Design an enzyme around this catalytic site. Structure first.
Site, PDB file in Angstrom:
ATOM      1  N   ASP A 181      -0.755   2.690  11.557  1.00 25.71           N
ATOM      2  CA  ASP A 181      -0.375   1.779  10.469  1.00 25.71           C
ATOM      3  C   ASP A 181      -1.522   0.831  10.091  1.00 25.71           C
ATOM      4  O   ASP A 181      -1.699   0.514   8.912  1.00 25.71           O
ATOM      5  CB  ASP A 181       0.855   0.932  10.862  1.00 25.71           C
ATOM      6  CG  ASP A 181       2.209   1.565  10.487  1.00 25.71           C
ATOM      7  OD1 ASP A 181       2.319   2.751  10.108  1.00 25.71           O
ATOM      8  OD2 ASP A 181       3.221   0.829  10.589  1.00 25.71           O
ATOM      9  N   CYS A 215      -2.767  10.225  -0.094  1.00 28.04           N
ATOM     10  CA  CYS A 215      -2.224   9.256   0.854  1.00 28.04           C
ATOM     11  C   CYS A 215      -1.335   8.320   0.039  1.00 28.04           C
ATOM     12  O   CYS A 215      -0.583   8.811  -0.807  1.00 28.04           O
ATOM     13  CB  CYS A 215      -3.360   8.571   1.618  1.00 28.04           C
ATOM     14  SG  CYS A 215      -4.783   7.973   0.574  1.00 28.04           S
ATOM     15  N   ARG A 221      -7.796   7.154   3.105  1.00 32.67           N
ATOM     16  CA  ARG A 221      -7.703   8.344   3.960  1.00 32.67           C
ATOM     17  C   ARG A 221      -8.079   9.621   3.195  1.00 32.67           C
ATOM     18  O   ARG A 221      -8.740  10.519   3.746  1.00 32.67           O
ATOM     19  CB  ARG A 221      -6.277   8.470   4.520  1.00 32.67           C
ATOM     20  CG  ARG A 221      -5.878   7.301   5.404  1.00 32.67           C
ATOM     21  CD  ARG A 221      -4.409   7.356   5.801  1.00 32.67           C
ATOM     22  NE  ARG A 221      -3.940   6.034   6.219  1.00 32.67           N
ATOM     23  CZ  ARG A 221      -2.686   5.758   6.560  1.00 32.67           C
ATOM     24  NH1 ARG A 221      -1.763   6.711   6.516  1.00 32.67           N
ATOM     25  NH2 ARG A 221      -2.352   4.516   6.925  1.00 32.67           N
ATOM     26  N   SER A 222      -7.631   9.739   1.939  1.00 31.55           N
ATOM     27  CA  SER A 222      -7.937  10.933   1.137  1.00 31.55           C
ATOM     28  C   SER A 222      -9.446  11.099   0.956  1.00 31.55           C
ATOM     29  O   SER A 222      -9.976  12.224   0.993  1.00 31.55           O
ATOM     30  CB  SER A 222      -7.253  10.839  -0.237  1.00 31.55           C
ATOM     31  OG  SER A 222      -5.817  10.916  -0.169  1.00 31.55           O
ATOM     32  N   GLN A 262     -12.033   2.823   1.624  1.00 36.59           N
ATOM     33  CA  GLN A 262     -11.513   1.499   1.243  1.00 36.59           C
ATOM     34  C   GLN A 262     -12.012   0.357   2.122  1.00 36.59           C
ATOM     35  O   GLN A 262     -11.878  -0.816   1.728  1.00 36.59           O
ATOM     36  CB  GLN A 262      -9.980   1.496   1.304  1.00 36.59           C
ATOM     37  CG  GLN A 262      -9.307   2.190   0.156  1.00 36.59           C
ATOM     38  CD  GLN A 262      -7.772   2.176   0.302  1.00 36.59           C
ATOM     39  OE1 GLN A 262      -7.197   2.859   1.154  1.00 36.59           O
ATOM     40  NE2 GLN A 262      -7.120   1.390  -0.523  1.00 36.59           N
TER      41      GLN A 262
END
Ligand SMILES: CN1CCN(C(=O)Nc2ccc(F)cc2)CC1
Length: 282
Positions: A181, A215, A221-222, A262
């Site tokens: 998370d 994502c 994440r992508s 990010q």
């Protein structure tokens, strides 16, 4: 510089935030006018994450052709990817329309439906064989065929039927279920194992349309997934693998979608994944 020793040099000097801010400063800025039209407000999950006009995927529809999705075309590596946000309640039919129209074989999902106690994307595939889904706005039917649950990821076989023509296709759903998370994984080993399973399926290969990867926003994440895949492919193709510059590859990918990677922690994790992955390949 090479990668593994550039890596230890940034760790020892603690300058990941400065490296990442340089990338942000040099990244491309292209218009995203279609994304910002008022009629598309409920098609975007986040107001600050939009596809560029020049690389956006168009739906084959004359009313409204907009979806928050981008085509990342990597010329030297000879790979293409579609990066998109997690589908919204009012875009699940558009999502599967895109999969159909672009002739994709696989969908890669890097998030859970609920994380941090909030919904990160819609439940857009069926959970039981006998309970199929019909998307009336785009005239598609989706059925769960089989499901294989493993410790770090799940693979599903899905049948997508175009109800207008009665054509059917088999779609593979690759679901990485264990990204934490907060932060990034401590080791890249399970993420790399997952990437290799997607590769082994044929979903990334030129005989199919581009893989669809998402994502929640479709940039963090992508971005890590496609950056690691492309860097490892280039290291196999080139005479000198130490010439592959992960920062230059990332800036090339950011010509096609804003914001890829990010955080500085995601940048460090991408380096780690490519470094460890290059040892296993040989
Ligand atoms: C068990 N086999 C596997 C191949 N297969 C399939 O449908 N492939 C496909 C092609 C093109 C596309 F766009 C999507 C999937 C089903 C029959």
């Amino acid at each position: 510089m090479e990668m593994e020793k550039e890596f230890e040099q940034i760790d020892k000097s603690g300058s990941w935030a400065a490296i990442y801010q340089d990338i942000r400063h040099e990244a491309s800025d292209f218009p995203s006018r279609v994304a910002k039209l008022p009629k598309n407000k409920n098609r975007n999950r986040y107001r600050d994450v939009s596809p560029f006009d020049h690389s956006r995927i168009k739906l084959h529809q004359e009313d409204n052709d907009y979806i928050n999705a981008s085509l990342i075309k990597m010329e030297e590596a000879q790979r293409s990817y579609i990066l998109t946000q997690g589908p919204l309640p009012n875009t699940v039919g558009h999502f599967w329309e895109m999969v159909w129209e672009q002739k994709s074989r696989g969908v890669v999902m890097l998030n859970r439906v609920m994380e941090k106690g909030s919904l990160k994307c819609a439940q857009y595939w069926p959970q039981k064989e006998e309970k199929e889904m019909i998307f009336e706005d785009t005239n598609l039917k989706l059925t769960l065929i089989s499901e294989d649950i493993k410790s770090y990821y799940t693979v599903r076989q899905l049948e997508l039927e175009n109800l207008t023509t009665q054509e059917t296709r088999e779609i593979l759903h690759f679901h990485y279920t264990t990204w934490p998370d907060f932060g990034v994984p401590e080791s890249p080993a399970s993420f790399l194992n997952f990437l290799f399973k997607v590769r082994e399926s044929g979903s990334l290969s030129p005989e199919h349309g581009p893989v669809v990867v998402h994502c929640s926003a479709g940039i963090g994440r992508s971005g890590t997934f496609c950056l690691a895949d492309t860097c490892l492919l280039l290291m196999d193709k080139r005479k000198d693998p130490s010439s592959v510059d992960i920062k230059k590859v990332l800036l090339e990918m950011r010509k096609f979608r804003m914001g890829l990677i990010q955080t500085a922690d995601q940048l460090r994790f991408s380096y780690l994944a490519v470094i460890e992955g290059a040892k296993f390949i040989m």
